[PDB]
Amino acid sequence: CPAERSGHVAVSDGRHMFVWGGYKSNDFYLPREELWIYNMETGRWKKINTEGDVPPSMSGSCAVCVDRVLYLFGGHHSRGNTNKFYMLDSRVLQWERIDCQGIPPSSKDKLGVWVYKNKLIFFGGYGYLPEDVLGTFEFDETSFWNSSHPRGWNDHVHILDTETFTWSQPITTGKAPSPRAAHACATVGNRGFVFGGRYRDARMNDLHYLNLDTWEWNELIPQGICPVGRSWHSLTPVSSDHLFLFGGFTTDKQPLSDAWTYCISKNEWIQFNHPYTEKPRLWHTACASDEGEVIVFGGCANNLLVHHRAAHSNEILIFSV
Ligand SMILES: CC(C)(C)c1ccc(CSCC(=O)NCc2cn(CC(=O)O)nn2)cc1
């Protein structure tokens, strides 16, 4: 039922997948008030129209679902990037914009988030120069000609404490990943993994994790064959020991349909064979089910940067991992 889209968000409790936002070609954004719910057990869709402080229609936003409470940060609306923070209690649904304390992150999109205890921990993204902070920001030289305000990538780590809805920045040790956007984040225990992403002229192949207890960065160097570097991929925990990688976009502008699992305990990648080899996706979403499956929705089958030829999808791809 839902219309095709890329750059949407999809979050889940393992049974119901909530889809919001994104854009398509016919860069018209999809209706801001619509919240699509996909039942992973029955395969049925349901649309509900939300009220309250409905966020602007956006692509590249960052969302999480914790105890059936939906949190949304950042994104790109018709007038640029944002750093607003929204909440939707899904337990008539009403959005609520939270006026957080502390210094918020810079306005940006295409980032990632880890969830650990009371903390939402955001990393990276693409957006405007920080108006103020810890980390590094690198301008995208091409942004000075295609836009009113220039933009760049960051390697910032920001915590939102949901106990007080206060922003802060942790003091991290170790070598942080370079600034990036369109990377993929995944959390298992107190480890926030990040893989790939776009930085300058490369879509990268490196894998790191941030210890969310000690705030120490670690680079992971798996031995043997590793997936090609990419952006606009998904990285989804499917167990306490495996992360599922699917899709994305290479430095060479190749849409990707390969799937892998990263085994955390063995520190190796395992390529996953599946029936969607002719169905590459970039800027899709991926959500894990309680039954071990990974549910991919939306995204684009070809180079979405050629807008007038972009092949956005509304297909559900089910990976039984
Ligand atoms: C309007 C139209 C539909 C044509 C459209 C335009 C632009 C975009 C995004 S491109 C601009 C940008 O924000 N560049 C920084 C960036 C990119 N990436 C991902 C990667 O390049 O792999 N990570 N950081 C998408 C659609």
Author numbering: 28 to 53, 60 to 124, 129 to 169, 171 to 359
Reproduce the article's own wording on this structure.
As a substrate receptor subunit of the CUL2-RBX1 E3 complex, KLHDC2 features a KELCH-repeat propeller domain, which can recognize the di-glycine C-end degron of its substrates with a nanomolar affinity. We set out to identify compounds that can anchor to the diglycine-binding site of KLHDC2, which has recently been suggested as a promising PROTACs E3 platform for targeted protein degradation.
Out of these, 29 compounds were successfully synthesized and characterized in an AlphaLISA competition assay, in which each compound was tested for its ability to compete with a diglycine-containing SelK C-end degron peptide for binding KLHDC2. While several compounds showed detectable activity in displacing the degron peptide, compound 29 (C29) stood out with the best IC50 of ~ 3 μM. To reveal the binding mode of compound 29, we soaked the crystals of apo KLHDC2 with the compound and determined the structure of the KLHDC2-C29 complex at 2.0 Å resolution. The triazole moiety next to the carboxyl group of the compound is nestled among three aromatic residues (Tyr163, Trp191, and Trp270) and stabilized by a NH…N hydrogen bond. The interaction of the compound with the E3 is further strengthened by a hydrogen bond formed between Lys147 and the central carbonyl group of the small molecule as well as direct packing of the tert-butylphenyl group to the auxiliary chamber of the degron-binding pocket. In contrast to the two ends of the compound, the dimethyl-sulfide linker in the middle of the compound shows poor electron density, indicating higher structural flexibility. Overall, the binding mode of compound 29 is highly similar to that of the diglycine C-end degron with a binding pose closely matching the prediction. Finally, a high resolution X-ray crystallographic structure validates the predicted docking pose for the KLHDC2 ligand complex, demonstrating the effectiveness of our method in lead discovery.
